[PDB]
Amino acid sequence: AVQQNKPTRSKRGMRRSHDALTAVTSLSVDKTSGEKHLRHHITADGYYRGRKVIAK
Amino acid sequence: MKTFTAKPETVKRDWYVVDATGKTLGRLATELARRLRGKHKAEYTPHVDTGDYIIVLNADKVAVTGNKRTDKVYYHHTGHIGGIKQATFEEMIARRPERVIEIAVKGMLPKGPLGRAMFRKLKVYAGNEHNHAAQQPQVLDI
Amino acid sequence: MYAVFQSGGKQHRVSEGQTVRLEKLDIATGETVEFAEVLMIANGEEVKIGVPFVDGGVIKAEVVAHGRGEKVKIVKFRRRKHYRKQQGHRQWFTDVKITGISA
Amino acid sequence: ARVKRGVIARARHKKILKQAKGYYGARSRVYRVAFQAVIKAGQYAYRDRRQRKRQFRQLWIARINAAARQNGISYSKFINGLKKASVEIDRKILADIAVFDKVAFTALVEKAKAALA
Amino acid sequence: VTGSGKKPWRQKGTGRARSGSIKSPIWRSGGVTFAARPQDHSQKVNKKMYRGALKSILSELVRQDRLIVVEKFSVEAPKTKLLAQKLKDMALEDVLIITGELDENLFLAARNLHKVDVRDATGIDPVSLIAFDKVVMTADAVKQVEEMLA
Amino acid sequence: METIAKHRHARSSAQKVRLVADLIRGKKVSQALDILTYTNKKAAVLVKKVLESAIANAEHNDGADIDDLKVTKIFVDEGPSMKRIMPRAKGRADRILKRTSHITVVVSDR
Amino acid sequence: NNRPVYIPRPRPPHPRL
RNA sequence: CCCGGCGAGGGGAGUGAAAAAGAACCUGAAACCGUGUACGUACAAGCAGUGGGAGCACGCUUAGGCGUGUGACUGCGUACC
RNA sequence: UGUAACGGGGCUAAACCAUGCACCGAAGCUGCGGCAGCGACGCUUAUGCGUUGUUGGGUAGGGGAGCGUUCUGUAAGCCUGCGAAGGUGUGCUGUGAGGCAUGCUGGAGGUAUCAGAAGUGCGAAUGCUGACAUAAGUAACGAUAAAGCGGGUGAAAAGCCC
């Protein structure tokens, strides 16, 4: 239930090797407004497929 | 001055062919182990693979004196519940004759990364035909 | 073109014009030395000694250095017996250059 | 006269850590562990100063044996000829000759064989 | 050490070392296993041994010509300049003016100077005699030194 | 030119922001901005503010043309931590470490 | 930075008798 | 003056002999945690070192090697009190 | 638990008996150099030895000789803002504890030699105090009465206001 002796910093680092994050690397540019956004998401200012969707 | 040490880059390795027909298993294997390790060369080095490549043919023709032909049993454990398996000389020859020669040499060779490295050079074929003629493997009388 | 000679309790194999680091001798740092104790001489042809120490072979060398060797640390330790000891050593050496090799 | 030991203690600890440099993990970072490694390293060095002589001796003997077998004589027989012929060449040289000057080593065995005969 | 004899924690069951009081020497803020006491370092020296030492030092100074015998050494007025001038002409910088009788004018003149020290025959110590580069005595001072040394 | 930019005593722990730092390390600022913009961590916005400041310092205090800038050196080192006592069961007490970190950003044209 | 003041009584051990 | 939330924090400027003396302030060690460079490491078993030792990367005078770092492989070797 | 009663391979001689000649084999002995202890001789006489021999594993413990730290005298001397102590490297040197020199940092104290005095040397005591790791970005986020949406303020709203 408890450790017999403290692990090594190397063993500590090896465990964290899989915790690294990954960038989306999939930024999409709207056809009309031309802003970067996630694919299948509305832009910050509210354009999707060019045509505005939020009307706000 | 400093004793000479063989440099792995500048090592010339020859190729030899040995026929295992009518040869004692252990006496044959001992010779191959000596050749594989390179102990027969004046530039031998314990930490360098200075040996030569050996091709063994007619492995199924190897013979053992006495009752070893039936009484010799090879045990190997599969690391499971009760996975202890035994096969005598006959079954090993019937299934794959090259295993006995490989096992005999592996035991006689040193254990470790270099020990495995030299064993890489052993090449055992059950039949009398080999596909290494491109290396000019001159026959070795031994 | 090399010779094997016994100088400081151990054979040395030296070629002509080579510097050999052997054990300390009672010679000055700018004084030539005598080695009439030659065990073997090799050339393009093969010559070997029928009797130890050849018959007329000799080695001429000039002493260049009389320094001390690299520091070596001697550590004696007994487990659980409360005994530890340390010591140092720097063996003396005499470096010489072989100027001549007779036959 | 109060005496502080801060300066001396660091000097001693650094001296040990300097000798322990290159070791793995805490053996080169922690004094309590580095001291064991330095002492243990000292024992091995003292032990190996003697093992080195025998390891090289056996290495030379193997080289001489390999040269003798290749040239048609056992190592034991070869040494007899030199002893009978009164040749004081040591193992280190004989191994040195065998690697470099094949012709010279051939001369050695011929007299060795002659001495036996 | 100020504090109390209370045990910080009971003597068993705790996962901590056994402690009796916060005043233990191995504890921070209180301790000192062997605290110093006010004691005198004075050492007894035999009268003959003390006298024998002075004779040896006096003999050595004479041999090394560090001792000079002169007549009366006095200053007309209590001014340091007069003493300084009377020593510069004599080429003395670190001198011990050992006089037969203490004179106020001489005492005041030498009081400011640190390399120059003036004392009576009674007030002499081995340390001062050795420390001072030169010692100049008076005839009366030498005479009284002879008799009390005996 | 170096145009460093540091943000000391950041709220987040040193570890948690290192994951964000590795994402943009060695990459050009242009892709760095959007990556941090669309990364779902506060360390993203925390690092983004520092990166924005670094760009501003480069543009203002030094040569313009921020387009050709790359994050040459991005690293984080843990800073001072605050000790807090938190009650536990059976009357025991433990210490809570409100860890902080310093984020340093270095952007250079070459 | 006060050292733990109240240490609870240890859990009774299994009877090895 | 600039970024930032009329912030925190930082970058310039400025004061000073010095701002890695900026009020978290003399000196600023160790454990501990990072970034960069060189080498080694994904078929190889164990007090992690020591003896031998190839290669590689950096410096030297010489063009032969020595120094520094690393360390494949190999002999021996089961911490301290 | 798995061959598991040659260490393994393997061996019909690589087994056993007898004989013989070789070799391997330790820190044993010898060879070369170096240091120290004790008894001797020829001669130095408070110390060198052309020398003679022998000894030098070691706990409890006894004996002998030393390094280093703080402070006092020597010292109102000596070193020092063209850079002290301390810190961090490197290079030399001693049988060892150590010493010396110098690069960077540092910024104003330091101290030869010979003596004297000790709070005079730490790795352990479930040692004391502070700092920082480990487990680990893991358990948990404190009643299973429950939230959803619009608008507002704001840099930012599942938690604030309507």
Residue A36 with chain F: CB contacts under 8 Å: 34
Contact of F88 with chain G, judged by CB distance below 8 Å, is answered with no
Cα–Cα distance, E9 to E19 (Å, whole number): 7
Query: Collapsing DSSP states into helix, strand and coil, what is residue C55?
Result: coil
Note whether G touches B: 3 CB pairs or more under 8 A: no
Phi–psi pair at B6, nearest 5 degrees: -65, 135
Cα–Cα distance, E108 to A45 (Å, whole number): 100
Q: Give Cα D112 distance to the centre of its chain.
A: 28
A21 touches strand I (CB under 7 A): no
User: What is the residue range of E124's domain?
Assistant: 1-149
CA distances from C16 to C42, C59, D81 (A): 11, 9, 29
Answer whether C39 sits within 8 Å of D87, measured CB to CB: yes
Q: Which of B42, B27, B24, B34 is nearest to B121 (CA)?
A: B34
Strands E116-120 and E95-99 come out as parallel
**Interface contacts (A, F; CB < 8 Å):** 19
C-beta of residue E69 within 8 angstroms of C-beta of residue E88: no
Neighbours of E132 (CB within 10 A): 20
Those residues with Cβ within 8 angstroms of residue B43's Cβ, 6 or more apart along the chain or in another chain: B4, B6, B50, D63, D99
One-letter identity of residue D96: D
Query: Collapsing DSSP states into helix, strand and coil, what is residue C41?
Result: strand
Neighbours of C75 (CB within 10 A): 17
Strands A36-38 and B73-77 come out as unpaired
Provide the experimental method for this PDB entry: cryo-EM
Q: What b-and-e string marks burial along D58-75, b requiring 16 or more CB atoms within 10 Å of the CB?
A: ebbebbbbbbbbebebee
CA–C1' span, A14 to H48, in Å?
19
CA–C1' span, C84 to I39, in Å?
31
Note whether D touches B: 3 CB pairs or more under 8 A: yes
Q: Which domains does chain F have, with CATH numbers?
A: 1-110 (3.90.470.10)
Q: In what order do the strands lie in the sheet with F70-78?
A: F4-10, F101-108, F70-78
One-letter identity of residue E145: V
Q: Which of D73, D116, D97 is nearest to C41 (CA)?
A: D97
Q: Which of residues 12-31 of C touch strand I (CB under 7 A)?
A: 23-24
Length of chain E in residues, anyone?
150
Neighbours of C21 (CB within 10 A): 14
Contact of G4 with chain F, judged by CB distance below 8 Å, is answered with yes
Total number of domains in chain E:
1
Q: Kindly report each contact of residues G5-9 with a partner whose C-beta sits within 8 Å and lies 24 or more positions away, as own/partner.
A: G6/F91, G7/E9, G7/E13, G7/E14, G7/E15, G7/E16, G8/F90, G8/F91, G8/F92, G9/E13
User: What is the residue range of C44's domain?
Assistant: 1-103
Phi–psi pair at A11, nearest 5 degrees: -60, -35
Among partner residues E9, E13, E16, which is closest to G10 by beta-carbon distance? Answer: E13
DSSP state, C74?
E
CA–C1' span, C94 to I113, in Å?
38
CATH number of the domain enclosing E81: 3.40.1370.10
DSSP state, E46?
-
Contact of F30 with chain A, judged by CB distance below 8 Å, is answered with no
One-letter identity of residue F68: D
Phi–psi pair at A4, nearest 5 degrees: -75, -35
Of the residues E9, E10, E29, the best mutation for testing chain G's interface (the one with the most G CB atoms within 10 Å of its CB) is: E9
CA distances from B2 to C22, C78, F62 (A): 13, 34, 60
C-beta of residue D106 within 8 angstroms of C-beta of residue D70: no
Phi–psi pair at B94, nearest 5 degrees: -65, -45
Q: In what order do the strands lie in the sheet with C32-35?
A: C19-23, C93-101, C59-65, C32-35
Neighbours of D85 (CB within 10 A): 18
CA–C1' span, C65 to I72, in Å?
50
B142 burial level (CB within 10 Å; 0-12, 13-18, 19+): middle
Phi–psi pair at E133, nearest 5 degrees: -65, -40
Cα–Cα distance, A10 to F97 (Å, whole number): 24
Cα–Cα distance, B131 to C1 (Å, whole number): 47
C-beta of residue D33 within 8 angstroms of C-beta of residue D40: no
Neighbours of A10 (CB within 10 A): 10
Strands B138-139 and B122-124 come out as unpaired
Among partner residues D56, D59, D66, which is closest to B42 by beta-carbon distance? Answer: D66
Cα–Cα distance, B73 to B76 (Å, whole number): 10
Residue of D nearest to A6 (CA): D26
C-beta of residue B87 within 8 angstroms of C-beta of residue B97: no
Residue F92 with chain G: CB contacts under 8 Å: 4, 8
Resolution, rounded to a tenth of an Å?
A: 2.6
Answer whether E14 sits within 8 Å of G9, measured CB to CB: no
Cα–Cα distance, C58 to C9 (Å, whole number): 17
Q: How many Cα atoms occupy the beta-carbon half-sphere of C61 within 13 Å?
A: 30
Cα–Cα distance, A42 to A54 (Å, whole number): 9
- Which nucleotide lies at the shortest CA–C1' distance from D26? H31
Cα–Cα distance, E59 to E129 (Å, whole number): 12
DSSP state, F38?
T
Residue of B nearest to D101 (CA): B42
Answer whether D67 sits within 8 Å of B42, measured CB to CB: yes
CA distances from C59 to A56, C17, D93, F3 (A): 104, 11, 17, 70
Those residues with Cβ within 8 angstroms of residue E119's Cβ, 6 or more apart along the chain or in another chain: E96, E97, E98, E99, E128
